[model samples]
Target: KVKRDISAFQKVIQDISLAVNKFNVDIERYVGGDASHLLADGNVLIKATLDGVQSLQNEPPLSSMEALALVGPVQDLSNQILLAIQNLIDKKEPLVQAGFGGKVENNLRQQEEAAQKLSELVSTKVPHELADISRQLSDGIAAGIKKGIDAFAGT
Candidate 1:
């Protein structure tokens, strides 16, 4: 796994922290306007993704595995959330009035950019236990492959 400077992650997280917060507020506003029209779980997942982004701010994980894995979904969901708002805008449906969809789109674009940056920067070293665990997994994979070859050969 690639390594990165921790302090850089602080800058990345801080930006995502603020940008995601902005998107969250707008989504709830959209939700408020079109509650009956909207799917409840969609908003729920955005809120959940927001919580995950915020948690990254509160606690910085150092394991390269943890750091990258943590942000991976944030970017994915944040991308979806961006389109989630865009769908509201694109459908020409449900609450695009008085700075609704347009405003949220601006915020989403910014958050999406920040989340992109996080993917490049957040990573660090693995702990010894994790290192050993990975080696064992690799060994198991090798054994599986060898077994497959032997089975195929009918020896």
Candidate 2:
């Protein structure tokens, strides 16, 4: 006969925000980008998205864990996008500096090489732990629901 006490849910949302902030720091440390990537006004729209998800715990349609799971993919996709951009930079710089102007063939060749390297890195180098954690959070929410239900059911 009790209402859905969202006190702990609020704490969960806070914890997830902290986790996302930590991830942002870790990414910046590991990736080393410009000022744009280091701030809230940066090219990384992922932070904005994370903030939006964290703000959702006070609303409907998604539980705390569900919202967290949704934010998880943002990090994974960010990692992939970073790798692809790095590949493009690696290939583009050499050609452009080599004074290969008006040569579309070299530009296309470098683009192709970057794409190939990007595919390889995405397949082999990107860590899988982010996805695993996302799955675990989603599954753990189900477990939490079961526990909550059992406690109330007097079983």
Candidate 3:
């Protein structure tokens, strides 16, 4: 039987993190102007990617299969978000130059795309069982971290 290697899983997680960082840089570059619609969606994507990374990191030790299963979906979701942001950027300038009505239409279209992509991502990429476990772990870690910060701040 093949052994489950934790290090390999860790490497996958690390790669996903690197991809997300690159995506963040791309978003900053593409949305440099006052593109409010793009910026709003981009912010959500960034936060979601970060939360996914943190959840994976906070998960207790797992078998290689388990780790791989969890990481694969997150990586896929990150890539999808990256692609959607790219698509939004491609459409931004032309619509902006087209004037007020065009910009409004573009904003609506972008929101719709973001929502659709997010829905597809959750349905297709995320494994429900593992995602639940990851979510619980992430929430627990976040709560503890927030409490620690609050205490340190004498709140």
Candidate 4:
């Protein structure tokens, strides 16, 4: 059951990655920056994607089991990446980097608002998914612990 749930979660992440990639241009338009910069929030994004792929590909028991633990951290990291992208878009940082700080302050304010919105989603929405996964894993763990305790007491 846990493995099945982990598999389902991996599929969700896979779908999100694909959907996000398809909307890359839109995200770029709103957030600004080339593909690399958009992708540059670092290991968390890569690890999450890789874990999802590995979960599907390897059929290793621990991969999916570990995925249960990885989900929360990865989502948190993705939220940060979203904020970074939002900052780039809000500040028109590309323009500033090209020597146009004329609107940097306004852009910064806009970026701050964008970041705030991202933060809200991270705080409120993203965690629900993570919480669901954590609850599933915790329930499994608790069941195992209870079984061990019961067996020991009976012995």
Candidate 3 per-residue C-alpha lDDT over 1-155 given as tens digits, one digit per residue, 9 for 90 to 100: 36544454455446545554554455456533444554455445445544444444433446446654655655454455445444544544543554432443443344344334433333343355566655544444334323322322311
Give the TM-score (vs. native) of candidate 1: 0.31
**Which TM-score value belongs to model 2?**
0.24
lDDT of 1 by residue, 1-155 (tens): 25545554445434444544554455456534543323333333334435444444544446746544534444444454444444344433344433344444443344344333332222223344455543443344334323323322311
RMSD of each: 16.0, 19.5, 12.8, 17.9
Error of 1 at 44 (Å): 16
Stretches of candidate 4 off by over 4 Å are 1-5, 29-67, 76-88, 91-155
Most accurate candidate by TM-score:
3
Lowest lDDT 10-residue stretch of candidate 1: 146-155
Segments of candidate 1 deviating more than 4 angstroms: 1-92, 123-155
The true-versus-predicted C-alpha distance at residue 13 of model 1, in Å, is: 9.4
Superposed on all Cα atoms, model 3 deviates from the true structure by an RMSD in Å of 12.8
Candidate 3 collision pairs? none
**Against the true structure, candidate 4 has what lDDT?**
0.41
Predicted structure with the largest lDDT when compared to the true one? 3
Candidate-wise lDDT, in order: 0.41, 0.38, 0.45, 0.41
In candidate 3, residue 64 scores what lDDT?
Answer: 41
Candidate 2 displacement at residue 66 in angstroms: 2.5
